[PDB]
Design a protein around this ligand. Sequence first.
Ligand SMILES: Nc1ncnc2c1ncn2[C@@H]1O[C@H](COP(=O)(O)OP(=O)(O)OP(=O)(O)O)[C@@H](O)[C@H]1O
Ligand SMILES: Nc1ncnc2c1ncn2[C@@H]1O[C@H](COP(=O)(O)OP(=O)(O)OP(=O)(O)O)[C@@H](O)[C@H]1O
Ligand SMILES: Nc1ncnc2c1ncn2[C@@H]1O[C@H](COP(=O)(O)OP(=O)(O)OP(=O)(O)O)[C@@H](O)[C@H]1O
Ligand SMILES: Nc1ncnc2c1ncn2[C@@H]1O[C@H](COP(=O)(O)OP(=O)(O)OP(=O)(O)O)[C@@H](O)[C@H]1O
Lengths: 112, 579, 445, 445
Amino acid sequence: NILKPALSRGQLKVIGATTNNEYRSIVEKDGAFERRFQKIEVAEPSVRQTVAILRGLQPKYEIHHGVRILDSALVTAAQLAKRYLPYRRLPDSALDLVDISCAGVAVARDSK
Amino acid sequence: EYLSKYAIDMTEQARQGKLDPVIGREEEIRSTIRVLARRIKSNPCLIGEPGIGKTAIIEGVAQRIIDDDVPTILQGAKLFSLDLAALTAGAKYKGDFEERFKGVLKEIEESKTLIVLFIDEIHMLMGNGKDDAANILKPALSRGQLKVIGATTNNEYRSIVEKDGAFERRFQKIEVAEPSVRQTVAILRGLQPKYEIHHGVRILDSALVTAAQLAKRYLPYRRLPDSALDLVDISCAGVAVARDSKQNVVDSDTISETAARLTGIPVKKLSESENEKLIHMERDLSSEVVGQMDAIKAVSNAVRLSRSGLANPRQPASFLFLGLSGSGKTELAKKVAGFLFNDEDMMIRVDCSELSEKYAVSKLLGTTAGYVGYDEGGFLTNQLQYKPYSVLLFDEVEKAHPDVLTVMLQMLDDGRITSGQGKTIDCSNCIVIMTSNLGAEFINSQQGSKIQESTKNLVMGAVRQHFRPEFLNRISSIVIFNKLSRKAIHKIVDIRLKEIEERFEQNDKHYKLNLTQEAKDFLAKYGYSDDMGARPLNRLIQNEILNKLALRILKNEIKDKETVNVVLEECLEVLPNHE
Amino acid sequence: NILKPALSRGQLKVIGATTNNEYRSIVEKDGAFERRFQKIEVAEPSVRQTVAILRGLQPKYEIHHGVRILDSALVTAAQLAKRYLPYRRLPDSALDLVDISCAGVAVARDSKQNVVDSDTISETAARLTGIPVKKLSESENEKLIHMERDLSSEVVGQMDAIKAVSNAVRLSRSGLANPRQPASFLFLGLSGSGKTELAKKVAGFLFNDEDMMIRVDCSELSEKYAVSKLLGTTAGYVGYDEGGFLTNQLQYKPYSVLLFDEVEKAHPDVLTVMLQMLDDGRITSGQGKTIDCSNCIVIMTSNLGAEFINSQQGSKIQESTKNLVMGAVRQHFRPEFLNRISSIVIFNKLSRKAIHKIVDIRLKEIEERFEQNDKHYKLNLTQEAKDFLAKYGYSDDMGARPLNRLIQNEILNKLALRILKNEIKDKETVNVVLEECLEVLPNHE
Amino acid sequence: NILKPALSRGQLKVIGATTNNEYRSIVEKDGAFERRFQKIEVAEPSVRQTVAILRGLQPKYEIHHGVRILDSALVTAAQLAKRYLPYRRLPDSALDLVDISCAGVAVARDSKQNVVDSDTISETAARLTGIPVKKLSESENEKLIHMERDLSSEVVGQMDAIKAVSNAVRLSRSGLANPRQPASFLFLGLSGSGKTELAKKVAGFLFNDEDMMIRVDCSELSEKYAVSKLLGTTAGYVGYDEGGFLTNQLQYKPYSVLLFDEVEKAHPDVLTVMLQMLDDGRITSGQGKTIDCSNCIVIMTSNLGAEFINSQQGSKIQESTKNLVMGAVRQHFRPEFLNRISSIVIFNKLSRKAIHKIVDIRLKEIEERFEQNDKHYKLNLTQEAKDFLAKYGYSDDMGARPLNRLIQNEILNKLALRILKNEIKDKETVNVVLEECLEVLPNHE
Ligand SMILES: Nc1ncnc2c1ncn2[C@@H]1O[C@H](COP(=O)(O)OP(=O)(O)OP(=O)(O)O)[C@@H](O)[C@H]1O
Ligand SMILES: Nc1ncnc2c1ncn2[C@@H]1O[C@H](COP(=O)(O)OP(=O)(O)OP(=O)(O)O)[C@@H](O)[C@H]1O
Ligand SMILES: Nc1ncnc2c1ncn2[C@@H]1O[C@H](COP(=O)(O)OP(=O)(O)OP(=O)(O)O)[C@@H](O)[C@H]1O
Ligand SMILES: Nc1ncnc2c1ncn2[C@@H]1O[C@H](COP(=O)(O)OP(=O)(O)OP(=O)(O)O)[C@@H](O)[C@H]1O
């Protein structure tokens, strides 16, 4: 790890990521990393934003599973997830409902 | 450089500005510095209550440090805000945070100019059983430079030093306190451009003043810097919304509506509709209060004094309602609340027949330390903390035990009502009413329905026999509730039936109410005794008229314009159908 | 136990050091410690020794601070420390006064000679202890000398009470006051006599603050419970933060004025508590701690004398009548209590002339009380209004208190109406029916 | 498997060793060790046995230190250890005294050899435990012989109390006092007669410090709290601050004076506890420890007898008059208590003759207690000031209390004012008219 600070003057640009909880641990454990990295907060999207994300990925799921998705379904996934999946952040929770649901359709369809 | 992983370099921030101006704290700063300039025990503390500038002082000294407005010793010193993760980063493995604390002190102790720490919350270190439990890691070196400015409230302070015993022999307490109202304004003024910039609005200088004065006379549980600043910031946010909606903080309206929203207290809102406000109330009350204009005016007068600020800030207006039993004075207290708050049920009341020397004071203000039950505030302050301005009512106060009666003097003047746990409530814009039937003996002289001169003194006599002069001479007004006699009760009955109609569920059936002498007399003959007063006028109206007609309504025998008449004690009303 | 077997073989000579109660928590939770070490008690040095210690350390401080310390300074610190810093042992307390005083010199120099003396220290001590005596502000002796007139400008007559208090203050300022005996008074007389008012004005005078006072309302007492309201309870019983009325105030403001209202109503066990306070000042606290309130001034009030003062045998109470007042006192309080009162003072009944003067002062206070300089009187009837108030408020058994009520009811309510109806703007005047009333100064101004 | 399966087979013969507390924390949790180890009780030996042990070890100490030890010294140590070191088991305790005593000689040896006799051992015990009686301070016999004199110069009158206490002190010092019965007194008398004054002066004499006294305000003791206030709470309750006021003092100052202020007010539950403390001495703590108070002097005070002393029937209390007092003490306290007091002493009335002497003492103490011990009196009027105070301060039924107050009222109050006005440096003087008053120093200071 010492190679990083040691050589870090020569650009050697690094992009990384960490959980809010982990960032705390990174900072406390190393110190230099806080001084070397620019912390960036990344926001959780609103339901409206989440749906826009889902729409972008909608064709990936439709193609992957061979099923269609109603636009209101994407809205529902994001909205429903916000209300009933408080333990999972929307970028994932909404997709979990979309992907699981698509599979449920394909799964039943492609059963015996 | 462990310090850089845990602390904020206040000096660097000051070097870069990005700090609020510091106003009026020069002496706290001078004291802080003077202690820091000491040969050995250079460990001052900023102590008081939250929201009194304790961290402002630090931003202040950080700026004085940047500009070399400090003693030789501090000229080149730097300051760091630590606490935080210094005690929690070591979430695992014994001795880990302890190592950090030590490493930090080592970093500070050796060579690198004079470094001063700022502990925002010394009580967080506490010394949890000593035995290396954080705070205890310091004392060994409190002489070895490692200068530090601490900070704590008095409760926190007292808790620490009482449990520790060494810190109070190592640290120099500096009293930090809320500013005077004018000093508060200067502070608000200093932060004025901060709020104006972030909200994009202006703040009138008079709004700063209003917030400062208001806070002093409005929020007893919040110290002036925060209290007045919150009135300013909260107001600025409201203005920013107006700005965005399509401005400035208006001394009168932004702050008053904000305050009215936050707490209430009608006085702090003061409606502009002067042609009717504080005028019409007498007419409204007159309808409820037939004949007894004397009580209405007594109340209205106090209400008028509280509005526009003539009333004394430490003297809740208060009345003693003496009179003929059944006079209706309790309802008056509610009807007054009706006008005052547009809420007849705003009040807090106590049944005084429940009071005894053995418990009454605690039933009212709560028990004290070490005793069972922490229903702090009992019947009263328990509720004042939510509605500081509500009307207070003491039912049959004449039956209250004299000791609790004496406690009630606090409501009447020098408004520092306290709680059993040693806390202060502070009442001002709060109208208080106590009730008694002593005047009944003189009213029953029937020398005019209106109590007369001399006879009212006989009433005062009866009052002195039951109430100490210490109580009586501090009442805004002692009001006597007069005989209603036949003329008022004829009006009361006509009115009660009307007022009931307006509130008798829904206006589906409607009334004629042609009582004629028959029903006017029934209600006025088998009802209004001088010693039952109006109580039976309402009870006969409900027990005989509203009830019998209601039963006919339930049978669907009534569709339109209900009437009233008698059988001719056998009268009993007994009303016909109206299908 | 790494040291344990080692020490048992006479190896590793170890020198320990700790606090009396820390030791207790060690040895009584270990046993082996008591076997391993030989405790040696370390004495607290006497004042005389303390001075010798300070003297021995003096050059270290002089060098550090760059100041000269005079011998009287050393003495002063040791003396003041024993008397005014009861919660800190002499080796530190005396040094704290020297060290801080020296720091004060260093600060003073850098804030803009360097010889530390008795006054240097006394002022410093006052800043640290709050004891006003040690400010030694002799140019203010005018107030201390004339505090009797100053008190008489707020309260009327009752000169014996004023003089009695004045001497408590003067004795304290002179340093002559007995270092262990808080000033103590028992104020006797009619309600409305000014007993409480005086105490407020004393607090006023001494600290420019009537709320400086620590009030204890004896009517809330019960011998079955209430002792704990003042001193708290002991370890074990529910609750702690002990002694909200006395312990938790006296450890912060030793120089404050205590007021015990209506001590005759106190149940006997509380009156018993007062005995510590009124003697030595070593008031104990429920958690086993002491207060040592010798710097305090204590005023107690009682209406037992109402029985004889309302004999009306002269406005200024005479012998026999006064002795009957003492009769009531002696028949109520145990002598053990009475013998601890520095002075038992019987207030005079107010004279009509006093009432006149009181009305003037009281009106002055009311006018001064307003936060809005519209709210004032000119009165007119410059004597007549006041005579009305006296004639209709001069109570031989309520004293001046009715003057307050009379004014509030006959003058201020009329003002309230006048404000409400905008009949008065400012400079209000008074007139009389047959029944005092006010004149109208309407929206003309 | 630390040891266990092997021990269970007769393998690894293991000899264990532990205390009862340790045993309990091991065995009650482990179970198996209760059977793996075969418990053998080892009793603490007798003094005779201890001495035999000391004799056997004597040569190890003599050789190490290069000293010679007398057999009587060894006996002395064992006896002293049993009596003065109750917190340390006898074998150790006896050795500590011998070893340390020898060390005493050894320290001197390097700076100057000797032998260790009984006197040396005794000094050592005092060095470690205070217990002044073992200092064998024979050169101080003068004080013990004349302590009555010294106390009589502090306290006028109360000769019976002084003699009674003096004897407690002498018996303790002479080694005649019973190791299980701390001397105890109950002082009955008028307030102001000097009950607590004597007690403080005794602590003064004994330790050169009145503050050494373990004062307990026993009057502030309601049933439910009172015992724990003094002994502390037991395991399982809020505040495990064992000892409250007594254990926490007794364990550190075993040779101290205890003072109980107004025991008549203490709830009987308190007195019930004190019964053991006063006789036998094994007061125990709330946590289950035995303290042992027997090296203390206990003074208890009360005012029941005031009701009869006020009859004026003798200065020295007369027969019958004393019985009225004893009647009251028997009516109020259980005989179980009264019987355990070493002596009940009824104080004399402070007669006018006494007040003449008391005035002198108080005037001197007033000067002595000044912080600013510069501003002394000259008084003048030796006979007239003395007489004024003697007459006006003679409120016989209030004891000397009124006198103190009189001096305060007539002299110090005025003095304080004169000081604020800078009218006095020192050598203050008194005049009288007819009313005692103070003069000024024309030269302000
Ligand atoms: N001159 C000032 N400089 C900075 N802040 C000030 C000043 N005057 C008042 N304040 C207010 O006080 C706050 C910090 O001051 P103060 O010490 O009163 O709070 P605090 O109680 O120290 O904070 P904490 O609860 O951490 O002790 C600021 O955030 C600001 O709102
Ligand atoms: N002079 C009056 N003031 C107020 N209310 C009155 C008056 N005269 C009649 N009333 C009517 O009487 C009724 C209120 O009676 P209330 O319960 O107050 O009896 P009360 O006399 O207050 O009993 P208490 O002797 O405990 O005060 C109301 O219906 C009210 O309209
Ligand atoms: N001699 C006086 N000079 C001026 N004001 C006085 C005097 N005597 C009484 N007062 C007035 O009386 C009021 C307080 O009086 P006082 O101290 O007599 O109450 P109090 O009777 O002591 O109450 P308490 O009977 O519990 O002591 C004050 O408002 C004060 O103006
Ligand atoms: N005979 C005396 N000689 C010297 N001083 C005395 C004498 N009698 C009383 N005093 C003075 O009285 C004060 C304490 O007196 P005393 O012991 O009588 O109080 P007390 O009345 O015992 O209190 P308590 O009534 O609770 O016992 C001391 O300050 C002391 O100077």
